[PDB]
Amino acid sequence: HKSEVAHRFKDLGEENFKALVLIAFAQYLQQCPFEDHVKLVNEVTEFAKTCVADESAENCDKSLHTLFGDKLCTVATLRETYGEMADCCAKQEPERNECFLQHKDDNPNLPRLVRPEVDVMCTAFHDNEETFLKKYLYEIARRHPYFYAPELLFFAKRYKAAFTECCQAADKAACLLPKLDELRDEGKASSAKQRLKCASLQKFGERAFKAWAVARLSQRFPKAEFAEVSKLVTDLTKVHTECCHGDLLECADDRADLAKYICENQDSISSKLKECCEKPLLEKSHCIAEVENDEMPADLPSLAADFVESKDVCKNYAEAKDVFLGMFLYEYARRHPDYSVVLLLRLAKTYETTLEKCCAAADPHECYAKVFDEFKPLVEEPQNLIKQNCELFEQLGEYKFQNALLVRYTKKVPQVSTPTLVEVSRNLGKVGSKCCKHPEAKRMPCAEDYLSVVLNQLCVLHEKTPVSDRVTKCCTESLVNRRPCFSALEVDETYVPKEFNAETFTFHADICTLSEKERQIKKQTALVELVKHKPKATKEQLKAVMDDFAAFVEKCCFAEEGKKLVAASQA
């Protein structure tokens, strides 16, 4: 268009425009205070209004990158605060913005955000609602420079709904705190899923990402033909490649073009896209990315005809292996939306290995004739883990299930630090409470999403501080074999028990006033140290020690009765 900034202002609207501009500047100038960014937003917005009134006005014909880069280089504190980022200003726009992207700090050293009191938040939300929501956008954008800015607007509007409803209820804290914990966890999980998917795209290559996209899209859109799914996978791969690069402009236009195409070909893709495609342009791609699974045609034949019993299995495979394997993934994924994506990739890799061996053997047809039998043990393994863990979760509670996982994982790998074993087991316990409530149709896909972000953060700290050879051996393994190995870990019999420290098991009455979360973490910390001290302790012996601890904590609310509890448990 003649004035691109005017076109953006008319499409997004003034409110969304200012919010997106605040996020854009906060992701590049992460160290500048909130008041400086509010001034920059008002200046860009006032300039955009001159272009809407007259697209032929001065500088209105410049590109968004030029206008943004020129405005980024007008900051007086650019040389002193960001240093090498000021050297980017001596380059032309094609190289200047790339120089800006290279200086985005994915891990800035900013202090933790502290949740204010409920009465303070509600008062602040009432006094100045706009700056309240803008402060949220500023703090999260500067801490996550690659966070998709429209998705950040999606969270900000949910905070507005949370404070609007809860600050007028009879009990504000009971209403607001569960919603804030939900928005906090989903926000941290969103940025964590983006970082993992971007890092996996650079390491494992584009082929592995397309294989993942084929499986997930075929589950999402089972009524679509393979040519349609393959066209969506190509566009989706291009979208993620650029969104991972950091250029917000190219990322958003790609997602806009993809959502526009999907909404224009609903009859060839899915029937569940009626609601998402009626939403505004800013919310299309985000909505489609979380659309519900469509129903399968139900008239789908078996896969043995095209992939097992046909005489041209090796011929069609030799013509284009990834296309043939992609068609195998497409057909298997559209028929099993209850499987996890990594499970479908597990079956595709098995079918790929089989064809490589069989198509070169003497009798290929007889060789891969029983390939589907290899898929059954691979499918039963996660299914039996879901039933085994959800049944154990049903007998116990969330806290008791977390303590059950603590003893299991401490015996298997006691070399891991105690706060890590506690934090991981608590998160794995929340995975069980969230996914075991779903029916079996959504249990395995639910577990995959939450386990992928928990197993990665377990090794996000273990890669910086290695302490176990078995843990780091399977976080360097393939992505489809990461979870199966963690389930295949065994008890370390060659582990000498840790020395008994009296100060470790020593407890004081200060834990009786602490919150429930604090008393649990303190009790769960001592449970790991007990297993590290006596890994050969039976489940019956361990329960007797835990039952005496719950009774001693109730009676002591000191050190005299604690000495008898240590000596009795040490026998």
Ligand X SMILES: CO/N=C(\C(=O)N[C@@H]1C(=O)N2C(C(=O)O)=C(CSc3nc(=O)c(=O)[nH]n3C)CS[C@H]12)c1csc(N)n1
Ligand Y SMILES: CCCCCCCCCCCCCC(=O)O
Number of residues that bind ligand Y (CB under 6 A): 65
Token readout for 121 is 């938040």
**Residue closest to ligand Y, measured at CB:** 326
Give me the least distance between CB of 188 and ligand X, in Å please: 5
Per-residue binder mask for ligand X (CB under 6 A), 481-510, x = binder:
------------------------------
Per-residue binder mask for ligand X (CB under 6 A), 178-217, x = binder:
--x---x--xx-----------------------------
Q: Does residue 422 interact with ligand Y by CB under 6 A?
A: no
525 CA to centre of own chain? 27
Q: Which of residues 124-163 bind ligand Y (CB under 6 A)?
A: 149-150
Residues contacting 314, CB < 8 A, separation 6+: 355, 358, 359, 364
Q: Does residue 142 interact with ligand X by CB under 6 A?
A: no
Give me the least distance between CB of 87 and ligand Y, in Å please: 24
The contacts found for 207-212 with CB under 8 angstroms, 24 or more apart, are 207/322, 208/479, 209/237, 209/240, 210/234, 210/237, 210/326, 211/325, 211/326, 211/329, 211/345, 211/348, 212/341, 212/345
Q: Does residue 143 interact with ligand X by CB under 6 A?
A: yes
Q: What angle do CA 540, 542, 543 make, to 5 degrees?
A: 65
Question: Which of ligand Y, ligand X, none interacts with 115 (beta carbon under 5 to 8 A by kind)?
Answer: ligand X
Q: Which of residues 302-331 bind ligand X (CB under 6 A)?
A: none
Candidates 124, 277, 396, 489: give the one binding ligand X (CB under 6 A): 124
Q: Of the listed pieces 133-141, 333-341, 466-474, 517-525, which binds ligand X according to CB under 6 A?
A: 133-141
Q: Which of residues 22-81 bind ligand X (CB under 6 A)?
A: none
Q: Does residue 342 interact with ligand Y by CB under 6 A?
A: yes
State which residue, 255 or 532, has the beta carbon closest to ligand Y. Answer: 255
Q: Which of residues 370-429 bind ligand X (CB under 6 A)?
A: none
257 annotated among ligand-binding-site residues: yes
223 annotated among ligand-binding-site residues: no
Question: Which of ligand Y, ligand X, none interacts with 188 (beta carbon under 5 to 8 A by kind)?
Answer: ligand X
Q: Does residue 355 interact with ligand Y by CB under 6 A?
A: no
Q: Does residue 148 interact with ligand X by CB under 6 A?
A: no
Q: Which of residues 234-253 bind ligand Y (CB under 6 A)?
A: 239, 248, 252
Task: Determine the residue type at 147.
Answer: F
Q: Does residue 139 interact with ligand X by CB under 6 A?
A: yes
C-alpha dist (Å) from residue 566 to 175, 351, 380, 414, 506:
42, 56, 43, 21, 9
Provide φ and ψ at 479, rounded to 5°: -65, -35
Token readout for 411 is 């015996």
Q: Which of residues 92-121 bind ligand Y (CB under 6 A)?
A: none
**Residue closest to ligand X, measured at CB:** 187
Q: Gaps in the chain (C–N > 2.5 Å) come after which residues?
A: 557
Q: Alpha-carbon distance 317 to 333, whole Å? A: 19
Give the single-character DSSP code of 497. P
Residues contacting 506, CB < 8 A, separation 6+: 559, 562
Q: Does residue 158 interact with ligand X by CB under 6 A?
A: no
Token readout for 226 is 């393979």
Question: Which of ligand X, ligand Y, none interacts with 116 (beta carbon under 5 to 8 A by kind)?
Answer: ligand X
Q: Of the listed pieces 136-144, 250-258, 313-321, 336-344, which binds ligand X according to CB under 6 A?
A: 136-144
Q: Alpha-carbon distance 383 to 539, whole Å? A: 26
Per-residue binder mask for ligand Y (CB under 6 A), 534-563, x = binder:
------------------------------
Token readout for 187 is 């926000």
Q: Does residue 115 interact with ligand X by CB under 6 A?
A: yes
Q: Alpha-carbon distance 468 to 18, whole Å? A: 49
Task: Determine the residue type at 178.
Answer: P
Question: Which of ligand X, ligand Y, none interacts with 18 (beta carbon under 5 to 8 A by kind)?
Answer: none
Provide φ and ψ at 563, rounded to 5°: -65, -35
Question: Which of ligand X, ligand Y, none interacts with 409 (beta carbon under 5 to 8 A by kind)?
Answer: ligand Y
Provide φ and ψ at 53, rounded to 5°: -70, -40
**CA proximity to 232, closest of 278, 263, 191, 202:** 263
Question: Which of ligand X, ligand Y, none interacts with 329 (beta carbon under 5 to 8 A by kind)?
Answer: ligand Y
User: Which residue in the block uniquely carries the two structure tokens 């094609």?
Assistant: 94
C-alpha dist (Å) from residue 389 to 122, 379, 385:
41, 16, 6
Give me the least distance between CB of 124 and ligand X, in Å please: 4
Give me the least distance between CB of 41 and ligand Y, in Å please: 11
Question: Which of ligand X, ligand Y, none interacts with 343 (beta carbon under 5 to 8 A by kind)?
Answer: ligand Y
Half-sphere exposure of 271 (CA within 13 A, CB side): 6
Q: Alpha-carbon distance 295 to 340, whole Å? A: 17
Candidates 343, 404, 406, 530: give the one binding ligand Y (CB under 6 A): 343
Region of 508 on the Ramachandran plot (φ > 0 left; ψ -120 to 50 alpha; else beta): beta
CB 422 within 8 A of CB 524: yes
Q: Does residue 565 interact with ligand Y by CB under 6 A?
A: no
Q: Does residue 71 interact with ligand Y by CB under 6 A?
A: no
Question: Which of ligand X, ligand Y, none interacts with 121 (beta carbon under 5 to 8 A by kind)?
Answer: ligand X
**Does an H or E element contain 540, and which?**
helix 539-555
Half-sphere exposure of 494 (CA within 13 A, CB side): 0
State which residue, 130 or 292, has the beta carbon closest to ligand X. Answer: 130
Residues comprising the binding site for Cu cation?
1
Q: In the complex, which residues of this chain contact ligand X (CB under 6 A)?
A: 113, 115-116, 120-121, 124, 135-136, 139-140, 143, 180, 184, 187-188
Residues at the contact surface with ligand Y, assessed by CB under 6 A? 8, 12, 20-21, 24, 149-150, 207-208, 210-211, 213-214, 216, 220, 230, 233, 239, 248, 252, 255-256, 258-259, 262, 281-282, 284-286, 288-289, 322-323, 325-326, 329, 340, 342-343, 345, 348-349, 352, 382, 385-386, 389, 409, 413, 416, 424, 428, 431-432, 435, 444, 447-448, 451, 478, 480, 483, 486-487
